[PDB]
């Protein structure tokens, strides 16, 4: 009965150097200034779809805690099977 500070503008936590590092893993050598906002949008869309499905599973089980298995099933049914989080 002591809830956290209302979440706002959290998209800004995806920092410029973090996206740069991810791009480095992808082999990108030079990065236009406009890339960052685009990346943020894409990421947000992806996340929305995943979290939507996960929460749907959570509600079907009449639980209030999203579990790792919920996420694994959501990802699996979108053709992005994830290994390592079973059991």
């Amino acid at each position: 009965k002591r809830h956290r500070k209302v979440l706002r503008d959290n998209i800004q936590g995806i920092t410029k150097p973090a996206i740069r590092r991810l791009a480095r893993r992808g082999g990108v050598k030079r990065i236009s200034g406009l890339i960052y906002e685009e990346t943020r949008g894409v990421l947000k869309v992806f996340l929305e779809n995943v979290i939507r499905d996960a929460v749907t599973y959570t509600e079907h089980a009449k639980r209030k805690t999203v579990t790792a298995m919920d996420v694994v099933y959501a990802l699996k049914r979108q053709g992005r099977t994830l290994y390592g989080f079973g059991g």
């Binding site: 893993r25 082999g27 992005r80 390592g84």
Partner: protein, 55 residues
């Protein structure tokens, strides 16, 4: 088998997820079979496009 080979190439005696990812991506038929699978803590294969290296 492939993961053990990779483990010895890296002079490691215990197979870890990195070795599994390397093993899977370096074998064409396994890579085909697991084309849509993400190996947690796997990373990617070292790979730089030739055009990016200096002349």
């Amino acid at each position: 088998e492939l993961a053990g080979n990779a483990a010895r190439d890296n002079k490691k005696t215990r197979i870890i997820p990195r070795h599994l990812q390397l093993a899977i991506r370096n074998d064409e038929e396994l890579n085909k079979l697991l084309g849509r699978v993400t190996i947690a803590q796997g990373g990617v294969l070292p790979n730089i496009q030739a055009v990016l290296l200096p002349k």
